[PDB]
Amino acid sequence: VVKEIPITHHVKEGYEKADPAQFELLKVLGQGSFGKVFLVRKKTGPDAGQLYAMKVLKKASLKVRDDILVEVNHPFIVKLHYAFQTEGKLYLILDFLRGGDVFTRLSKEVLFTEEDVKFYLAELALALDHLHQLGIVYRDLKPENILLDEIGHIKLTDFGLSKESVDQEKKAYSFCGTVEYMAPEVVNRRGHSQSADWWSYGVLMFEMLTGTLPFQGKDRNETMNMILKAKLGMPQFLSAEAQSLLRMLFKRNPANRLGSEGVEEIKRHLFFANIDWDKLYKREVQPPFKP
Numbered sequence: 001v002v003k004e005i006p007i008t009h010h011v012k013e014g015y016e017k018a019d020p021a022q023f024e025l026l027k028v029l030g031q032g033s034f035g036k037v038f039l040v041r042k043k044t045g046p047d048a049g050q051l052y053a054m055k056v057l058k059k060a061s062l063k064v065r066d067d068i069l070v071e072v073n074h075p076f077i078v079k080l081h082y083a084f085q086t087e088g089k090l091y092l093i094l095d096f097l098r099g100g101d102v103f104t105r106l107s108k109e110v111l112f113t114e115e116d117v118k119f120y121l122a123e124l125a126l127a128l129d130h131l132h133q134l135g136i137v138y139r140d141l142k143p144e145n146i147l148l149d150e151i152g153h154i155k156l157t158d159f160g161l162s163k164e165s166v167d168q169e170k171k172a173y174s175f176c177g178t179v180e181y182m183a184p185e186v187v188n189r190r191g192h193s194q195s196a197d198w199w200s201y202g203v204l205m206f207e208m209l210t211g212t213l214p215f216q217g218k219d220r221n222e223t224m225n226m227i228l229k230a231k232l233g234m235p236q237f238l239s240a241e242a243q244s245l246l247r248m249l250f251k252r253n254p255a256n257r258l259g260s261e262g263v264e265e266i267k268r269h270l271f272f273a274n275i276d277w278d279k280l281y282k283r284e285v286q287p288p289f290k291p
């Protein structure tokens, strides 16, 4: 059964409860759909002087089928250090990633190869599956949630939090995820799923390997109709293995889709035959680009 766990308090093991005065603002790091991400310096305590990313929201819960803010820990997912409530606001204190998003870094190259993209898709795959084993769904995978750390390893900026903006105008017109990355059944309002994450994952693969989105129209409605019904040519410049992974991810019906039976069939796919998943998880594999 899908249970919604409200997020109101969090302290990482070994530390003490935080409040807004313990953090000083340095400079904004970016803006999402749920607000702004600020760079902050911890003022006092054991971790005084340490830098963190900070998110300001209204409310934030976590839906889980069937500790949880500690279980979501993973080599390729951002760590939440603190969460607290004050004056109608929820503050999230996070790991501050210094590398920027993957798309920016890729745009800084004239060209790149399937192998580079393969590094990113592999780490990402491990992150997704990790959340799915905990009964969590990422829901809204997008390029803006995929950052680089200092070394050039992947970090997701979230782990499926159901969030609510504090800006009253932005909260007013908020609904679901980013349509360009939605699986057909999500578009058809049948609900988010692990399988839908793997569709999103496929769309990110296509976009990374072609520089283009597979379905986009002149507006919301047209984009949706394309997702459901439009044609999609196979990029002929891709290897047979890449063509095969793409072909197996892009099934409009879930449980027909690769990954809807775990990530093992994804890890075993000919496209990742090159990858030592144990070394990958241990961050012993060398990133294609330094940030």
Ligand SMILES: Nc1ncnc2c1ncn2[C@@H]1O[C@H](COP(=O)(O)OP(=O)(O)NP(=O)(O)O)[C@@H](O)[C@H]1O
Pocket (backbone or CB within 6 Å): 029, 030, 031, 032, 033, 034, 035, 036, 037, 053, 078, 094, 095, 096, 097, 098, 100, 101, 140, 142, 144, 145, 147, 157, 158
């Ligand atoms: N921990 C972090 N460290 C550094 N930069 C971050 C961090 N989290 C977010 N950002 C930046 O801030 C922007 C917002 O990221 P995101 O976490 O997606 O915001 P959001 O509103 O929570 N979700 P979305 O609505 O999908 O944007 C991104 O473009 C990131 O580059």
Ligand SMILES: Nc1ncnc2c1ncn2[C@@H]1O[C@H](COP(=O)(O)OP(=O)(O)NP(=O)(O)O)[C@@H](O)[C@H]1O
Pocket (backbone or CB within 6 Å): 002, 063, 064, 065, 135, 136, 137, 139, 162, 175, 176, 177, 190, 191, 192, 193, 194
């Ligand atoms: N962890 C999960 N496991 C399985 N199904 C989930 C999970 N989380 C959400 N769902 C499904 O996604 C739906 C939640 O979306 P709902 O609140 O009905 O409107 P929504 O706007 O699509 N949600 P959101 O995208 O978070 O704003 C439910 O009907 C669930 O079946």
Ligand SMILES: [Zn+2]
Pocket (backbone or CB within 6 Å): 175, 176, 177, 192
């Ligand atoms: Zn939704």
